[PDB]
Amino acid sequence: MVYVCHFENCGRSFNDRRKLNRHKKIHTG
Ligand SMILES: [Zn+2]
Numbered sequence: 001m002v003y004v005c006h007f008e009n010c011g012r013s014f015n016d017r018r019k020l021n022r023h024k025k026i027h028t029g
Helices: 017-027
Strands: 003-005 013-014
Touching: 003 017, 013 017
Parallel strands: none
Antiparallel strands: 003 013
């Protein structure tokens, strides 16, 4: 699935769950 890291430190979009899941770590630590 595609997801959008529209968060207040990124404003990015990622055409894969693996690419958002691996990136979301950088917004948890
Ligand atoms: Zn992001």
